[PDB]
Design an enzyme around this catalytic site. Structure first.
Site, PDB file in Angstrom:
ATOM      1  N   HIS A   1      45.407  42.340  46.797  1.00  6.95           N
ATOM      2  CA  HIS A   1      45.485  41.489  45.603  1.00  6.95           C
ATOM      3  C   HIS A   1      45.400  42.276  44.289  1.00  6.95           C
ATOM      4  O   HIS A   1      45.744  41.760  43.258  1.00  6.95           O
ATOM      5  CB  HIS A   1      44.389  40.393  45.610  1.00  6.95           C
TER       6      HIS A   1
ATOM      7  N   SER B   1      36.785  44.676  43.183  1.00 14.22           N
ATOM      8  CA  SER B   1      37.795  44.394  44.198  1.00 14.22           C
ATOM      9  C   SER B   1      38.552  45.656  44.592  1.00 14.22           C
ATOM     10  O   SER B   1      38.860  46.465  43.762  1.00 14.22           O
ATOM     11  CB  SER B   1      38.840  43.377  43.689  1.00 14.22           C
ATOM     12  N   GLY B   2      38.792  45.837  45.892  1.00 13.04           N
ATOM     13  CA  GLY B   2      39.517  47.003  46.366  1.00 13.04           C
ATOM     14  C   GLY B   2      38.600  48.176  46.698  1.00 13.04           C
ATOM     15  O   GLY B   2      38.974  49.080  47.410  1.00 13.04           O
TER      16      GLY B   2
ATOM     17  N   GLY C   1      36.688  43.272  39.208  1.00  8.92           N
ATOM     18  CA  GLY C   1      36.829  44.691  38.902  1.00  8.92           C
ATOM     19  C   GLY C   1      36.254  45.618  39.967  1.00  8.92           C
ATOM     20  O   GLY C   1      36.455  46.793  39.906  1.00  8.92           O
TER      21      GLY C   1
ATOM     22  N   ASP D   1      43.743  41.321  53.154  1.00  4.58           N
ATOM     23  CA  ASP D   1      43.658  41.799  51.784  1.00  4.58           C
ATOM     24  C   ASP D   1      43.370  43.293  51.766  1.00  4.58           C
ATOM     25  O   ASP D   1      42.275  43.732  51.532  1.00  4.58           O
ATOM     26  CB  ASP D   1      42.571  41.027  51.021  1.00  4.58           C
TER      27      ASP D   1
HETATM   28  N1  BAA Z   1      38.558  42.352  41.465  1.00  4.69           N
HETATM   29  C1  BAA Z   1      39.612  41.642  40.962  1.00  4.69           C
HETATM   30  O1  BAA Z   1      39.973  40.674  41.546  1.00  4.69           O
HETATM   31  C2  BAA Z   1      40.394  41.928  39.645  1.00  4.69           C
HETATM   32  C3  BAA Z   1      41.799  42.445  40.043  1.00  4.69           C
HETATM   33  N2  BAA Z   1      39.948  42.750  38.504  1.00  4.69           N
HETATM   34  C4  BAA Z   1      39.774  42.231  37.250  1.00  4.69           C
HETATM   35  O2  BAA Z   1      39.830  41.051  37.084  1.00  4.69           O
HETATM   36  C5  BAA Z   1      39.456  43.087  36.012  1.00  4.69           C
HETATM   37  C6  BAA Z   1      38.763  44.403  36.332  1.00  4.69           C
HETATM   38  N3  BAA Z   1      38.620  42.483  34.999  1.00  4.69           N
HETATM   39  C7  BAA Z   1      38.803  42.835  33.729  1.00  4.69           C
HETATM   40  O3  BAA Z   1      39.685  43.595  33.407  1.00  4.69           O
HETATM   41  O4  BAA Z   1      37.586  42.722  32.955  1.00  4.69           O
HETATM   42  C8  BAA Z   1      37.594  42.358  31.563  1.00  4.69           C
HETATM   43  C9  BAA Z   1      36.185  41.867  31.321  1.00  4.69           C
HETATM   44  C10 BAA Z   1      38.564  41.188  31.203  1.00  4.69           C
HETATM   45  C11 BAA Z   1      37.865  43.620  30.726  1.00  4.69           C
END
Ligand code: BAA
Ligand code: CA
Length: 240
Positions: free
Chosen positions: A45, A188-189, A186, A93
């Site tokens: 994802h 994730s993965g 963030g 995933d």
């Molecule tokens: N873990 C995930 O599902 C997702 C792909 N990552 C995010 O949503 C990112 C890291 N969040 C994001 O960029 O954070 C701010 C607070 C909007 C800067």
């Protein structure tokens, strides 16, 4: 990571930051694990968007020069054939990223040890989640790599009514759920590192948390179970 502590610089050397090109800068979006000098394992994802991605190894503080980073482009993305963006609860995933160049291993950049195929951890196994994800539900990203102690919640407990029910599959690992510590957006993965026979191995790829919040009691962080995908990982690397 919610309820984490700052990781030492050399504790989790297989951790990578997956970043996408955003205007003139690069932005962290997901974690990953370096599994070969030119292959990274992450969540499918994280690469659903058709963005320009790069990987940073030897990273600790996202916003400062650490003197240890190597920056490398993503040359090929292989997502699991069965991944369906509209159905994360179905599993699968996971994705493999072939890097444009091989990175140099040193005390900050090392390959992640993978579990043997089919290995299932006993309930309440000692594991750590690591990442630069949000440190609070609807908060902001961490500057420095965080870690949180997240013991596993086995499938029978995690798929019960009061936990995730039918949403969790046996191809997934649950960890945490205490309402204080968890993965978050963030992360994730990224890896779930579990101590098995005196060695840390990467047993999960962070996949999802509750729509209600990152740290929610009885909604443990859910991970793709790496040991369910060892044949697939090895078949992809042996042909690309
Ligand atoms: N873990 C995930 O599902 C997702 C792909 N990552 C995010 O949503 C990112 C890291 N969040 C994001 O960029 O954070 C701010 C607070 C909007 C800067
Ligand atoms: Ca840095």
């Amino acid at each position: 990571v919610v309820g984490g502590t700052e990781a030492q610089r050399n504790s989790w050397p297989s951790q990578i930051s997956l970043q996408y090109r955003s205007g003139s800068s690069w932005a962290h979006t997901c974690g990953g694990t370096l599994i070969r000098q030119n292959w990274v394992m992450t969540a499918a994802h994280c690469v659903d968007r058709e963005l320009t991605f790069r990987v940073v190894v030897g990273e600790h503080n996202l916003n400062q020069n650490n003197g240890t980073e190597q920056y490398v482009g993503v040359q090929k993305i292989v997502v699991h054939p069965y991944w369906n963006t509209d159905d994360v609860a179905a599993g699968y995933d996971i994705a493999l990223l072939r890097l444009a160049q091989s990175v140099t291993l040193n005390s900050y950049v090392q390959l992640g040890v993978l579990p043997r195929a089919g290995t299932i951890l006993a309930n309440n196994s000692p594991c750590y989640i690591t990442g630069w994800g949000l440190t609070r539900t609807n908060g902001q990203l961490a500057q420095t790599l965080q870690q949180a102690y997240l013991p596993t919640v086995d499938y029978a407990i995690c798929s019960s009514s009061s936990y995730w029910g039918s949403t969790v599959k046996n191809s997934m690992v649950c960890a945490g759920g205490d309402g204080v510590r968890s993965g978050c957006q963030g992360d994730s993965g990224g890896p779930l590192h579990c101590l098995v026979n005196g060695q840390y191995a990467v047993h999960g790829v962070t996949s999802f948390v509750s729509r209600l919040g990152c740290n929610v009691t009885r909604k443990p962080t859910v991970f793709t179970r790496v040991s369910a995908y060892i044949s697939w990982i090895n078949n992809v690397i042996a042909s690309n």
